[PDB]
């Protein structure tokens, strides 16, 4: 599995079967972009995970 990771395509570790994309906004000026290989999403996070190469945006 290969996933996008902030301008790089990285190869996932054998135990990372998913690519992931999510964003966070904890403070008015602060945005977080979580992008990369990952393990399984939460139930709440169901669509933040994808299983195909380079699928994470």
């Amino acid at each position: 599995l290969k996933c996008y990771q902030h301008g790089k395509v990285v190869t996932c570790h054998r135990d990372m079967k998913f690519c992931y994309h999510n964003t966070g906004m904890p403070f008015r000026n602060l945005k977080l972009i979580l992008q990369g290989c990952s393990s399984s999403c939460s139930e709440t996070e169901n669509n933040k995970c994808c299983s195909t190469d380079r699928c994470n945006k």
Copy 2:
């Protein structure tokens, strides 16, 4: 002063005479972007601040 703040334009409080845009990566899969109104940046990152409306593109 007005500044960009993650897709919107916000009006700054009186004591905030700067627009800021700083981009970090504290972990490989996590990017952080500070964008909004601000007080003065430090000298080391002096250019991270600008002082005109919508300057922090």
Copy 3:
């Protein structure tokens, strides 16, 4: 003004008349803590700012 900034005490720039301590959790496994000198907080989070040395414990 002096404020706590993640285990240290820093002197604030002239235009920063507040100490701030805000704690967020944009993802379940990720906590974010803002602690340092600051300009004025918003009304909605008015109490997140204080105005005396080392007030932002």
Copy 4:
């Protein structure tokens, strides 16, 4: 596997064989605490991962 997750002990998903602890400091006022279940650490992150219940701090 059970790991600490910001004041909670959570049960890891079958594909999360590790607990994880790390911190990030991308900006002078900003500290990040990454704590929870995880998949395998990077090579650079070798000691941020642990394999026993509640081992992540």
